[PDB]
Amino acid sequence: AKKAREGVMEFLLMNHPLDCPICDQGGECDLQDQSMAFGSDRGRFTEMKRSVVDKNLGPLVKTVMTRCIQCTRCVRFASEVAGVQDLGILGRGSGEEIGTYVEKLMTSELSGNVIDICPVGALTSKPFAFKARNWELKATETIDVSDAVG
Amino acid sequence: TEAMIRNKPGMASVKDMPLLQDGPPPGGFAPVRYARRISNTGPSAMAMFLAVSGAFAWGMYQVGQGNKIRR
Ligand code: SF4
Ligand code: SF4
Secondary structure: OHHHHHHHHHHHOOOOOOOOOOOOOOOOOHHHHHHOOOOOOOOOOOOOOOOOOOOOOOOOEEEOOOOOOOOOHHHHHHHOOOOOOOOOEEOOHHHOEEOOOOOOOOOOOOOOOHHHHOOOOOEEEOOOOOOOOOOOOOOOOOOOOOOOOO | OOOOOOOOOOOOOOOOOOOOOOOOOOOOOOOOOOOOOOOOOOOOOOOOHHHHHHHHHHHHHHHHHHHHHHO
């Protein structure tokens, strides 16, 4: 089991760009916290990682699909929970790219939660562009008052 | 990585990596002294008393002769 986990966390960090310093979700990252806990301490891949252009997904979700690991979590969230069906896993192989095939802002509300859904920095809040870090933020378990769902 | 940081053109293998870091030269350094080499080659117990006492015997004779000249 541990060798299988290390194997996979090497593949994920293989074509993944070294964007952790410039990644908005640098501290709060499943990939960083699984590599630093279950993945191997070193990487043997020394070649040309694949890179992906940044899709325009609107004024909410800043997208850096190079970081994205193509786990498909968001393309499932938009199809099922958000129910708008705009995101897609275009292409096959390493060339897999997540996002709308035509430039299409995620017109759906409830589609800003894809950032919390995303286990990787790729999909991040564009309003919270880089303004802070996962460790600076003091958290209060407040409620919301915008809409009456509370 | 670690085979793209320490290149050494060729080398056919992950071993034989350059590995040039600081250390003693081949054959170590010189034998360094650590003991207390305090040389006691000074005037002995005598030769210091006999230099002093020789003076307070000839020099005092000279004080006497100078007192005779002054008188
Ligand atoms: S998601 Fe961002 S912070 Fe996490 S490993 Fe990838 S580049 Fe680094
Ligand atoms: S949730 Fe994030 S990491 Fe997963 S496929 Fe979508 S963009 Fe890629």
